[PDB]
Design a protein around this ligand. Structure first.
Ligand SMILES: N=C(NCCCCNC(=N)NC(=N)Nc1ccc(Cl)cc1)NC(=N)Nc1ccc(Cl)cc1
Ligand SMILES: N=C(NCCCCNC(=N)NC(=N)Nc1ccc(Cl)cc1)NC(=N)Nc1ccc(Cl)cc1
Ligand SMILES: Nc1ncnc2c1ncn2[C@@H]1O[C@H](COP(=O)(O)OP(=O)(O)OP(=O)(O)O)[C@@H](O)[C@H]1O
Length: 519
């Protein structure tokens, strides 16, 4: 039987339109999902939306709509975007669905019953322009009155903050500290990249985990605490349980949950790694549930000297990139340009360079040159592979095998840009092999027809390798390449067909009417 593999993106907050930042996470998850499917895993890939809170309530009111009206529109547009990116997600979780709300309610009541949660008062300091609450120790220019902080400025914006006090339920998370830290020791690959771990534990665990305010009373757009409905469940419990509620946890059919939980990987950017590495495992401990195997926190797409953000408006719309440059281009750029773990700036120039030089030129010209030569020299009939007949073949065939091996290692460690660059070294090599072998010279001599056929056979096999390896990344080009080469055997499109070079040992009629693979 097939081993399960369960991967998630964060549930995104639809307070504005999604941008290439969000597409980065979602395409990255899709690449992993598609890769794991090709490796023979039974895959489930989840994404969704985080729909509660005062900000959504405010956005809806400003737009003259109810919350659910506003959300249904925003989510329709998000679902359109994923369809347009050809995301292979098996489900889409909305926190407004009853299947989700039921879990949030039951989890909260269970924690109340166990004594994990107790009633108190939340105190904080709100900044309007930051839309952020701060603790008193975070405030700049604290103003004192009889030894007590009665005011200050936000450390981000410098704006005057306002005191907030409201009845709130608190989650005792500190009692799980030793268990959490033991989990980290036993599972060294849990936090990825491991460079994230030190800072996170130094700043957030070392000083002591404060009791966590897990409800609010000052607004009503949220999952209501059944036994105390003036309280709504705040972000921590509401958003985090999506990963299990989507699987029918605590429903009448827990089969998806029993099959796929625990998650093999939660994907996210670095600004929410602490919530998925501290609060999330602790919540799962309170429920006596298995912990996720890995949390990967990638870096940020940057622009205008800062993180791309729908609040700041420093954004690039993925819909515009797809319409202007095509789908493969967009997906390729996202996975290739920014190494998975580091930060990087978006520029239009880097986008066009990356996509024209690598896709249309290196790969596109390779396929065009190859097919046109087969058409010219053999009237479309590609001679069957025989062996490494040319003096360069043994080493190039060895490169094909090493390309696969290296790619695999890069893919397993989630270094997508490296996997891609490795594929492209082989693509570039294959173009060079045309220059080195000069097939047009071989075509003049009738005695050289066998060698010419061998050169053609090696070009197509190299192309086939590249096309297979690109299937997780590019959804259009590999299929197009297979069609134009007229490789119909579905087995020759799978990873296992890359074990031994030279699978095409019957002649094939390539396309008589080739066209550019891109855009
Ligand atoms: N910096 C943060 N501090 C905590 C306050 C968050 C309030 N702002 C939100 N944008 N809330 C939301 N995404 N959701 C939300 C859900 C329910 C309710 Cl009642 C209110 C808000 N959080 C954050 N930026 N995002 C976040 C995302 C996922 C998780 Cl698991 C945790 C935090
Ligand atoms: N960078 C560090 N990495 C984490 C060390 C490995 C965690 N494993 C445990 N088996 N920790 C423990 N039971 N507790 C623990 C407590 C004190 C110390 Cl000296 C070490 C571990 N930590 C650090 N520099 N200080 C630290 C201090 C207090 C706490 Cl609660 C957590 C971390
Ligand atoms: N600039 C970015 N680079 C990489 N990933 C991003 C970026 N922006 C968003 N994401 C993805 O979406 C998740 C949530 O980000 P979020 O929507 O809060 O960013 P935002 O657009 O700045 O929103 P807000 O303006 O409300 O902070 C991240 O954890 C990540 O998976």
């Amino acid at each position: 039987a097939k081993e399960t593999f369960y991967i998630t993106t964060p549930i995104y907050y639809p307070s504005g339109n999604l941008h290439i930042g969000h597409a980065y996470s979602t395409v990255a998850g899709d690449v992993i999902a598609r890769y794991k499917r090709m490796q023979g895993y039974d895959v489930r890939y989840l994404t969704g939306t985080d729909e509660h809170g005062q900000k959504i309530q405010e956005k809806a009111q400003k737009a003259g709509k109810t919350e659910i009206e506003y959300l249904d529109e925003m989510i329709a547009g998000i679902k359109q975007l994923w369809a347009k990116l050809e995301i292979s997600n098996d489900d889409f979780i909305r926190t407004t669905e009853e299947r989700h709300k039921h879990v949030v309610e039951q989890v909260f009541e269970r924690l109340l019953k166990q004594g994990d949660i107790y009633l108190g008062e939340y105190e904080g300091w709100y900044s309007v322009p930051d839309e952020t609450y701060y603790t008193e120790s975070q405030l700049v220019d604290p103003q004192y009155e009889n030894g007590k902080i009665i005011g200050g400025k936000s450390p981000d914006s410098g704006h005057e903050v306002e005191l907030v006090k409201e009845e709130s339920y608190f989650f005792n998370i500190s009692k799980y500290t030793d268990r959490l830290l033991e989990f980290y020791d036993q599972n060294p690959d849990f936090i990825q990249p491991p460079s994230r771990k030190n800072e996170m534990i130094n700043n957030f665990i070392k000083p002591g985990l404060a009791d966590l305010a897990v409800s609010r009373t000052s607004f009503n757009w949220g999952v209501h605490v059944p036994s105390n409905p003036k309280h709504v469940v705040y972000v921590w419990i509401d958003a985090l349980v999506n990963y299990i509620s989507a699987l029918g946890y605590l429903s009448d059919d827990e089969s998806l949950f029993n099959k796929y939980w625990p998650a093999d990987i939660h994907l996210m950017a670095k600004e929410i790694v602490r919530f998925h590495s501290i609060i999330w495992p602790i919540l799962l401990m309170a429920l006596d549930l298995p912990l996720p195997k890995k949390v990967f926190a990638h870096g940020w797409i940057l622009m205008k000297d800062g993180k791309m953000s729908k609040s700041k408006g420093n954004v690039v719309d993925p819909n515009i990139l797809i319409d202007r440059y095509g789908l493969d281009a967009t997906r390729y750029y996202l996975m290739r340009e920014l190494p998975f773990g580091s930060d990087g700036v978006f520029t239009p120039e880097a986008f066009v360079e990356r996509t024209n030089f690598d896709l249309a030129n290196d790969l596109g010209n390779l396929v065009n040159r190859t097919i046109s030569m087969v058409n010219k020299y053999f009237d479309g009939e590609l001679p069957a592979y025989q062996g490494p007949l040319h003096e360069l073949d043994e080493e190039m065939e060895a490169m094909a095998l090493e390309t696969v091996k290296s790619y695999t290692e890069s893919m397993e460690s989630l270094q997508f840009s490296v996997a891609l660059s490795t594929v492209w070294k082989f693509i570039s090599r294959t173009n060079k092999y045309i220059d080195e072998t000069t097939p047009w010279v071989l075509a003049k001599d009738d005695s050289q027809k066998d060698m010419l056929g061998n050169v053609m056979a090696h070009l197509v096999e190299n192309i086939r390798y590249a096309a297979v390896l690109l299937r997780p990344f590019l959804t259009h080009a590999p299929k197009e390449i297979f069609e134009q080469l007229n490789i119909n055997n579905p087995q020759f499109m799978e990873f296992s067909s890359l074990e031994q070079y030279g699978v095409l040992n019957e002649s094939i009629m390539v396309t008589g009417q080739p066209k550019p693979i891109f855009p």
